[PDB]
Amino acid sequence: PPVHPFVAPLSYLLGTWRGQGEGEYPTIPSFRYGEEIRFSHSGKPVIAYTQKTWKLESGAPLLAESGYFRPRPDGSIEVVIACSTGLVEVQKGTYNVDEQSIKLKSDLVGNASKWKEISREFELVDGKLSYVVRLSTTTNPLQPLLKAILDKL
Amino acid sequence: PPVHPFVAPLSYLLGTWRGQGEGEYPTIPSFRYGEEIRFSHSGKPVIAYTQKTWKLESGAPLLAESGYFRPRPDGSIEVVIACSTGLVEVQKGTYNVDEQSIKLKSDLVGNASKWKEISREFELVDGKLSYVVRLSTTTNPLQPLLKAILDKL
């Protein structure tokens, strides 16, 4: 399967990333986690995304997500994600081929009444995949929650 | 690892299913598709679901979806799904251990303005997994869209 021309600008994502991150939020005291993310494709104008996080010290599973990245040649992109916690997300924004970055704001957060906005920003930095996830809640404004850096395998 | 007691009632699902199905809807002329579904778990109170469909005759990929089945011992169950078409779904309902059936109605259909409600009912019949997906849209009431029957591999 060749990479679809719609997906070609993001082909640096494709493969298996592994690394580690940190969470902290006003409500949640800080923590570290292992993370693995696989981007794959089947020759269509879509990238499939799957992800898992585990306890850094125990290797005991925490969360999983899966979804689909849908980029379009005008630089816009939508991402739909389902989480093992029972949450769904519609994410929208842009990608920049120069910066090899992707900036997303939730258009919808579903099945999580307390969580308002979620943004996710990816960025290839030094050949490693980085992201910041931000969360806003009923009571707390939008602010970082998760930061990670992963090596491509 | 080993089956969480919450997932235990649904352990028949676990594995890879392969079969075919049919789509028809007032707007859409009838079509057939090949379909593969994989239910798996990592010992948590959740079943991961991934699915793909392809053209019966050509073998060309059509859609894919992924998400999570979350059953609870009160017989209730919640399913979240992300689709390669950029849709998300929150499904809610019940499973019946006697009938080996699962009946879900969407609590939310996300990023698909014309589609209002999607119901999904599964049933193990004769060792085969079979389902009906129902759709209502802005102008059409709820009615079958997809019917499939899969063999466990």
Side-chain angles (χ1 to χ4, degrees):
Chain A
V3 174
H4 199 282
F6 269 48
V7 154
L10 298 194
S11 69
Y12 63 89
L13 292 179
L14 296 170
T16 300
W17 300 85
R18 185 185 230 127
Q20 91 169 244
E22 204 189 311
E24 196 149 16
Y25 201 81
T27 186
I28 304 151
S30 91
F31 58 93
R32 288 155 103 82
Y33 57 91
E35 176 161 24
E36 178 167 302
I37 294 193
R38 163 161 187 250
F39 293 101
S40 57
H41 83 95
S42 53
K44 299 281 194 210
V46 174
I47 299 149
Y49 161 75
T50 65
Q51 179 259 220
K52 68 179 186 188
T53 58
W54 58 88
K55 271 184 180 159
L56 240 216
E57 342 67 26
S58 36
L62 290 159
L63 301 193
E65 28 174 68
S66 48
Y68 301 89
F69 283 51
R70 311 161 33 77
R72 311 262 250 234
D74 60 348
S76 66
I77 184 160
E78 107 190 323
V79 179
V80 285
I81 291 157
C83 316
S84 71
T85 60
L87 204 96
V88 287
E89 285 179 51
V90 186
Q91 291 285 347
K92 293 191 186 188
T94 52
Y95 60 98
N96 191 293
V97 185
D98 273 307
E99 313 159 0
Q100 303 177 293
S101 88
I102 302 175
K103 306 201 163 160
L104 302 165
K105 312 201 333 150
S106 58
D107 190 46
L108 171 131
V109 173
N111 208 36
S113 69
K114 294 269 180 131
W115 292 6
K116 294 318 192 173
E117 263 254 305
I118 300 176
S119 60
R120 297 172 176 254
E121 297 166 28
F122 297 85
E123 201 197 348
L124 202 72
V125 283
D126 276 342
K128 304 168 184 305
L129 187 64
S130 57
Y131 69 69
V132 181
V133 183
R134 299 178 153 136
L135 195 97
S136 81
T137 62
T138 315
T139 64
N140 280 291
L142 201 85
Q143 57 193 317
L145 174 69
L146 306 180
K147 284 156 189 203
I149 344 174
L150 312 79
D151 302 311
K152 191 182 255 165
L153 294 184
Chain B
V3 183
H4 197 277
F6 275 34
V7 164
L10 292 195
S11 68
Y12 64 85
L13 290 186
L14 294 167
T16 296
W17 299 84
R18 179 177 243 142
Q20 77 175 258
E22 207 184 306
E24 194 146 38
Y25 202 77
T27 188
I28 301 151
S30 76
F31 56 95
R32 300 228 219 263
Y33 54 93
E35 172 162 38
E36 187 172 297
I37 299 183
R38 177 169 172 246
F39 295 103
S40 63
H41 76 98
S42 65
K44 295 291 183 215
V46 191
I47 304 159
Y49 159 78
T50 74
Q51 183 253 227
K52 73 200 190 180
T53 55
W54 60 88
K55 275 192 171 160
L56 262 207
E57 341 69 24
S58 30
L62 289 162
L63 300 195
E65 58 185 28
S66 44
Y68 298 97
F69 279 50
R70 305 165 36 79
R72 316 253 251 233
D74 61 358
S76 73
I77 179 155
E78 137 186 285
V79 177
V80 299
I81 302 166
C83 312
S84 57
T85 52
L87 217 83
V88 293
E89 308 173 45
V90 186
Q91 295 279 0
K92 299 189 191 213
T94 61
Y95 61 98
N96 190 298
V97 186
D98 282 295
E99 320 159 1
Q100 296 179 301
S101 94
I102 311 184
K103 297 194 169 164
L104 303 163
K105 288 176 39 109
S106 60
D107 186 52
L108 168 153
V109 174
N111 210 31
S113 69
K114 301 255 187 133
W115 286 15
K116 297 325 203 166
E117 303 138 34
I118 297 175
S119 72
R120 285 170 186 255
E121 309 183 9
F122 293 89
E123 197 195 355
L124 197 67
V125 286
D126 253 341
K128 308 186 191 300
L129 178 69
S130 90
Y131 71 66
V132 175
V133 183
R134 275 139 115 230
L135 178 81
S136 76
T137 68
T138 314
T139 67
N140 277 274
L142 200 85
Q143 60 197 296
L145 170 59
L146 309 174
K147 287 161 187 204
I149 320 168
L150 318 76
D151 299 356
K152 205 194 208 163
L153 312 165

